Amino acid sequence: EAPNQALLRILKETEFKKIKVLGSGAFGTVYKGLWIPEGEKVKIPVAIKELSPKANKEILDEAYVMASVDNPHVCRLLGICLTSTVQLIMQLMPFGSLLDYVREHKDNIGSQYLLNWCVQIAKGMNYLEDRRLVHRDLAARNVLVKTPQHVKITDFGLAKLLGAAAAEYHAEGGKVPIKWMALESILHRIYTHQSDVWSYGVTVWELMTFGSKPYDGIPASEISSILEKGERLPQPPICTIDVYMIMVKCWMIDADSRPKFRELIIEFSKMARDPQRYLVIQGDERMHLPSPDSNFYRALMDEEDMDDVVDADEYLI
């Protein structure tokens, strides 16, 4: 109901430079690059998403959503460039997606990092619920890694701002990832913040299995029947019953019986106090993750003079 006074910043194409392709596909191509606001003497590492009329509209809808959120655990939109191909300029998350990260660094990821990631994702989702935003595509796929100690939620291509006095979004026909969806979303295309909680549970299962595919080998058509019988994702080997019970609660058929994101923050925060009591990982105590200075950014951006580099989180309007 409140007016959305978020500012949409229009960027000139000449004040940022593409450096390398990060990903390419039907959705478009994301470039790693530097944004140099003219006259500010700063260089901001950015990800540039480059997008047909229907594709131009969906790009601007995503920009609308990202420009309306401001939280340390939700990805930051810096602005848009109105070229022949509309471009989204976002904060560079140099360590990639959390799904790829847990797969690549499986042998050096301890319980402290896993539980902290669960807290940060829950904080970001709780903020989105405070903003009356339903993500509809929460997954380890769509959590990006700024540093091993700091992750943020991204990919708002499916995200829907709940209209005034609306408790749910009713989709129609759009292709959706079934294996992360709540059962009521599968059967009835009904999406709520509590449906996001279900997807949060699958996301935690992805992390605790170090990036396993949920319901692996099963076609998506069979998924809805599997869940109706009462079958759920198995208990990950490293998970105590304490952690697994939280995931199971996210998968209750009664959406109101699932935990709230503000409660998921609390419960995982308690476990993060004593992480080895709740996740059992061999060699946990001796594991180490990089967490890199100026030398880190010279190699990342393929440029020597990184004296004026500034991360987007320290560049405020």
Ligand SMILES: C=CC(=O)Nc1cccc(Oc2nc(Nc3ccc(N4CCN(C)CC4)cc3OC)ncc2Cl)c1
């Ligand atoms: C939805 C499909 C898809 O793959 N989208 C995608 C792909 C690449 C980047 C991307 O968006 C971002 N990516 C990043 N960081 C990042 C992501 C992936 C990578 N890698 C690099 C190695 N390999 C190619 C896999 C992808 C590296 C990154 O930083 C160096 N930071 C911010 C954004 Cl907005 C989205």
